[PDB]
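User: Could you write out the 3D structure of this protein bound to calcium ion? I've included everything you need below.
Assistant: Certainly. Input first, then the structure.
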Amino acid sequence: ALRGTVTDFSGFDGRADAEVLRKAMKGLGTDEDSILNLLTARSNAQRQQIAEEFKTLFGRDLVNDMKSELTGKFEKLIVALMKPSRLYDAYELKHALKGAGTDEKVLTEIIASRTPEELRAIKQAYEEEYGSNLEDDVVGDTSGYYQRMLVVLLQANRDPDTAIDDAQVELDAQALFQAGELKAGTDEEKFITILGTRSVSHLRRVFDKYMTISGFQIEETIDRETSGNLENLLLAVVKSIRSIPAYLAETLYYAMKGAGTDDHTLIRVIVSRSEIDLFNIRKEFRKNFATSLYSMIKGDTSGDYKKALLLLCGGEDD
Ligand SMILES: [Ca+2]
Ligand SMILES: [Ca+2]
Ligand SMILES: [Ca+2]
Ligand SMILES: [Ca+2]
Ligand SMILES: [Ca+2]
């Protein structure tokens, strides 16, 4: 159903490509153009084979060489495209946690939009790489109900998608109604359990039924009922339950919409989704924000950075 914008290259010859990359870096200067035109046109799997060939041909590390030749945002963008798919989210997560500061925005974004299937892989990939337990790192860097919601999510235990049980839809909407609007204060525990564990098809029916019953969209109650990270988290979850692409098209938009740009978010969403559903993200960006993602990246970015990005995203009309 989903569609990314980067696919496997047809006449792939990892050895030929590595040679092109060597030339682009050998001697004085760099042919950034040759680099970017090549790398944004191979799938992540192919980029791993190229790095492999490069090492057996020249005994040099493709990524470490690039880190020496490139600079600024282009570098960061090229370094991210080189990260093996199975490892990127883990890498972004580890980096949001580590340090004297945590980027809850990153924690929220990845954990809420990734499916249980993806969360399990991410958890494995994370432990094998940093020799730490993701849950334990999140738990230690966060607190309150925000932390709880994240753990519930990390269990990747969401119920499966069965035929919808109306009595059950009714029950859950009423429960949410009683846990928030009809209450002085909030029963966050009830929101966490219903939002974090019920199936996706079930919750979509509950969101609607809840509108019917209360006159509010669950999003408005959340905003009325909560604050801080828990609010952002719950909104992210609700948004992703409705449509992950749509939720991501929106975090992309707010990354640029502001004055300058949140390049880390721009890089992270475009790269991480390039081979999953970036095409869908593009479509949702047009519908809801009037302009294609292309036109928007095009005006906020520049340099080879802008060229690579536009080449990865593509679609001038979306
Ligand atoms: Ca050089
Ligand atoms: Ca550098
Ligand atoms: Ca209340
Ligand atoms: Ca609020
Ligand atoms: Ca801007």
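Residues 25, 27, 29-30, 69 surround calcium ion (ligand 1) (CB under 6 Å).
User: Perfect, thank you.
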